[PDB]
Design a binder for this molecule. Structure first.
Ligand SMILES: CCCCOc1ccc2cc(S(=O)(=O)N[C@@H](CCC(=O)O)C(=O)O)ccc2c1
Length: 430
């Protein structure tokens, strides 16, 4: 693709909007930028030479465009953007621009839960093998910042929003790990619309990796992973491939059944990508986990404080609660922007004499309502933590696994997690 002489418009700033801007500049094309936010991040880095429109979408700019590069953060359904598509104006995203330029195979990963883990694991498997690997997308660096001639493999986490605007992806290996309710504020046609966006990842993929335990991950053969069934399966616990033991999970630092199926998924994608199994299995024994993903930030005085701020949907929090072992009382922090999710699937894990709920953020009242008799509601996570702190006892667990976006009150789930760990360390020691 060649963009010279094109009127290009980018919707959305930040590092991703800026990576798009750099992409076009370096090609001898000056784009225009708009953001619906008044002072979006990165505005300051923008080279004065690029005109910008903030606080709203500029229809004059859009309708005059030859190409619109839409951040995953804006809906294709937005009236201004639907108008442009109706006019036949081409709309793509960063991932589409990347795929058109990429000169190395791409491993593509999406799903409601486990996608950052499996993306990171596959990158670790490549690294152990001596492969020059670029890992990013919806995790880490924006995809366009990974473009490098020396790169031998790319491993991208892709969100459903990125996939909606991508059409040139031809993955060497692609997976949807699972599909559980998320982003309903962005999918007015419900779960099947959301699933439809994720299913796009398989179009033109050399190998499709599917979850034998989750029919929604299926297209319409794929290599499969699952617990008791699949080409990659569990059998102490061993990872197996087609009946053959490959790894005793005692060698892994990660624990839990869901991280074991994450391990199969990664192995399946690495295998499809042609990485040696020895180095791939080795990476599985060295990977320690991501920050904010069920991360023990404090274990002091008989109490563990777990930062699971990366739990931004119901299915994620469920993966935290399902089979959880707590000696005393579980103090569960829930809260933020639920994205119109149905929280009732959590109810099942919240019976008993040993659970306390501390709910906050935009949807706090909705979360407290899962079990009002053991629930407390506050405006902030800080107020909730100071509320729960005096009550914690030896044998207790304090778990931040909010089931919601943090965007109503925090920059991102990382700042939420960082504030959690700060407070835990303050309230968790005399
Ligand atoms: C006009 C451009 C709009 C730019 O603003 C935005 C950019 C990206 C976004 C991503 C998403 S997002 O839906 O991907 N938000 C994450 C938030 C996770 C977290 O708490 O850190 C989630 O709930 O999965 C929502 C809104 C966005 C708005």
């Amino acid at each position: 693709a060649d963009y010279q002489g094109k009127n290009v418009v980018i919707i959305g700033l930040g590092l991703t909007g800026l990576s798009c801007v750099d992409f076009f500049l370096a090609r001898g094309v000056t784009p225009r930028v708009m953001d619906t936010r008044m002072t979006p991040p990165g505005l300051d880095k923008l080279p004065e030479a690029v005109e910008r429109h903030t606080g709203s979408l500029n229809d004059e700019w859009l309708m005059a465009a030859d190409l619109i590069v839409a951040s995953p953060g804006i809906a294709l359904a937005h009236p201004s953007l639907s108008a442009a598509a109706d006019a036949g104006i081409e709309i793509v995203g960063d991932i589409e621009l990347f795929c058109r330029e990429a000169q190395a195979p791409i491993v593509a990963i999406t799903g409601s839960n486990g996608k950052s883990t499996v993306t990171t694991l596959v990158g670790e498997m490549a690294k152990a093998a001596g492969v020059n690997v670029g890992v990013g997308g919806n995790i880490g660096l924006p995809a366009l910042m990974l473009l490098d001639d020396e790169c031998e493999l790319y491993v991208l986490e892709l969100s459903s929003f990125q996939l909606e605007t991508t059409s040139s992806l031809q993955a060497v290996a692609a997976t949807i790990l699972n599909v559980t309710e998320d982003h309903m504020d962005r999918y007015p046609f419900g779960l099947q619309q959301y699933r439809a966006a994720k299913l796009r990842i398989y179009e033109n993929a050399k190998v499709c990796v599917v979850n034998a335990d989750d029919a929604l991950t299926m297209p319409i053969r794929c290599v499969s992973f699952g617990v008791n069934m699949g080409d990659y399966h569990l059998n102490e616990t061993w990872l197996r491939v087609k009946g053959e033991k490959v790894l005793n999970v005692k060698e892994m630092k990660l624990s839990g059944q869901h991280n074991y199926t994450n391990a199969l998924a990664a192995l399946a994608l690495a295998d499809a990508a042609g990485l040696p199994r020895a180095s791939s299995l080795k990476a599985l024994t060295t990977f320690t986990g991501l920050p904010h993903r069920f991360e023990v930030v404090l274990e002091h005085n008989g109490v563990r404080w777990i930062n699971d701020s990366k739990a931004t949907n119901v299915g994620s929090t469920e993966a935290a609660l399902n089979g959880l072992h707590v000696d005393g009382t579980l103090h569960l922090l829930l809260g933020g922007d639920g994205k119109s999710a149905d929280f009732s699937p959590l109810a099942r894990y919240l019976n008993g004499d040993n659970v306390r709920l501390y709910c906050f953020g935009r949807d706090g009242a909705q979360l407290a309502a899962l079990r009002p008799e053991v629930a407390e509601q506050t405006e902030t996570m800080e107020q909730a933590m100071r509320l729960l702190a005096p009550r914690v006892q030896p044998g207790d667990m304090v778990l931040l696994s909010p089931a919601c976006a943090s965007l109503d009150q925090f920059k991102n789930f990382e700042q939420r997690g960082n504030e959690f760990a700060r407070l835990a360390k303050e309230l968790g020691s005399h």
